[PDB]
C-alpha cells in the first residue's frame with residue numbers, strides 16, 4: 001500500500017539532512033509499536049501510523065517559533081529542506097479515506113535537543129522503510 | 139541520611155570536610171556484659187553496651203569497629219568516609235579521561251543494539267581497591283539491567299607511573315534492539331580505596347555508544363590493470379537482520395596520500411600501488427555513531 005522505495009529514498013535523505021543540521025511529551029518508536037522486522041511482517045500499518053505521527057510532530061516544531069525566529073538560521077541551513085522532507089514523507093504515508101493528521105533567548109538549546117531527538121527518530125524510520133523495500137516489496 | 143548502609147556491616151559516613159569541621163555523630167549497634175569496643179586491631183577499649191556513639195571527623199575515626207564479649211567477637215561495623223569539600227564529592231580513585239567531555243570517569247561501548255555493553259575505567263592505584271557496578275534504564279521507574287563483576291582488564295605504563303584498567307559487562311534485561319530509545323541507560327560504580335568511598339555515574343543511549351566490529355573477511359581480487367575488486371562482510375557481532383540494521387563503509391587506499399571512498403555495498407573497486415594497503419571500516423548507516431576499527435590487507 002505505501003511506496004516503499006519512495007519512502008526509503010525520502011527517509012534516507014531525512015537522516016542526511018538531520019545530521020547536516022546538527023553535526024517527555026515527544027512521540028517515540030516504542031517497542032510495542034511493531035516497527036521491528038517481525039512486527040512489520042505481521043502488520044506494518046501500526047508502525048507506519050506511528051512514524052507518520054512522529055513526522056507531523058517534528059514538522060510542526062521545525063516550522064514553529066523555536067526555529068523561525070532569532071537567532072536567524074544561516075541562509076544555507078539544512079533545516080529548510082529538513083522541514084520540506086518531513087512533509088514530503090508524511091504525505092506519502094497518508095492513504096486515501098484515512099485522516100491521520102491530528103521565554104529566554106537561550107532556547108537554542110531546545111533547537112539542538114529537538115534535532116538530536118529527530119536524528120534518533122528518522123534513523124529508526126529509515127531502517128523500517130529500507131527493510132520493507134527489501135522484503136515487503138514486489 | 140548522612141550515614142547509610144552500603145553493604146552488610148559496611149556504612150558510608152558523608153563527611154563535609156573543612157578546617158575544624160565537627161564531622162558526624164555515628165551510633166553503632168551490636169548484633170550483655172563485657173561488650174567492649176575496638177578499632178581495627180587495637181585492644182584499646184572505647185565503650186560498653188549494645189550501642190556505641192563516636193564522632194567521626196577524619197579517616198582516623200573510620201575503620202572496622204568490633205563489639206567484643208568475653209574475648210569472643212560478636213559483630214563488626216566498617217565505616218567508610220565519603221568526603222565532600224565545598225559541595226563536590228572527591229573523585230581521587232578514578233582517573234578523568236576527559237573525553238568526549240570533561241569529568242568523564244566511565245566510558246562505555248556497544249558492538250550492536252542487543253542491549254549488551256561494556257564499560258571501562260582507569261586508576262593509578264594498584265591495591266586495596268573494591269569496585270561494584272549497577273545499572274538500569276530510567277531513573278524514576280528503573281528497568282532491569284544486569285551487570286557482571288568488575289575485573290582488571292589491562293595495565294599500561296603512562297609516564298613513570300602505571301595505569302590500571304578495569305572493565306565490566308552489562309546487559310539490559312528486556313532489550314528492544316529496534317526501538318527508539320527515550321530513557322537513557324544509567325551506569326553506577328561504587329569505588330572503595332581503603333577507607334575512602336566514592337561513586338561515579340554515566341548516562342547514555344545505546345545508539346550513542348555504538349562501535350561496530352571491523353569488517354570481516356577483507357579480500358582483494360586483481361583484474362586485467364591496477365584495478366582490484368575489494369570485498370568484505372558484515373561483522374558477526376552486528377545486529378541482525380542486516381536489511382534492517384544496515385552499515386555504511388569507508389574504503390581507503392593508503393601507503394606509508396589518502397584515497398577514501400564511501401559506499402553502502404560490501405564491495406568496491408580501487409587502484410592498488412606499491413607498498414600500499416586497502417583498509418575498510420564500518421559505521422551505522424542511519425545514525426552517526428563511532429566508526430569501527432580499520433580492517434586492512436596489503437596490496438599484491
Ligand SMILES: *[C@@H]1O[C@H](CO)[C@@H](O[C@@H]2O[C@H](CO)[C@@H](O[C@@H]3O[C@H](CO[C@H]4O[C@H](CO)[C@@H](O)[C@H](O)[C@@H]4O[C@H]4O[C@H](CO)[C@@H](O)[C@H](O)[C@@H]4O)[C@@H](O)[C@H](O[C@H]4O[C@H](CO)[C@@H](O)[C@H](O)[C@@H]4O)[C@@H]3O)[C@H](O)[C@H]2NC(C)=O)[C@H](O)[C@H]1NC(C)=O
Nearest residue numbers: 139140141142143150152220227272326327328336337338
Ligand atoms: C553515591 O554517593 C552519594 C553520596 O554519598 C549517595 O547519596 C546518598 O545515598 C544514600 C542511600 O540512598 C542516602 O541515604 C538514604 O536516604 C533515604 C532517604 O532519602 C531519600 O528518600 C526519602 C523518601 O524515602 C525522600 O523523601 C528524600 O528526599 C530522599 O530522596 C533523596 O534522594 C537522593 C539521595 O538518595 C537525593 O539526592 C534527592 O535530592 C532526594 O532528596 C533513607 O530512606 C535511607 O535510609 C534507609 O535506611 C534507614 C535505616 O535502616 C531506614 O530507616 C530507611 O527506611 C531506609 O531504608 C538512607 O538514609 C543519602 O541521603 C544520599 N546522600 C545525599 C547527600 O543525597 C548515592 O546514593 C550514591 N550512589 C549510589 C548509586 O550508591
Ligand SMILES: [Tb+3]
Nearest residue numbers: 140154161162
Ligand atoms: Tb551533618
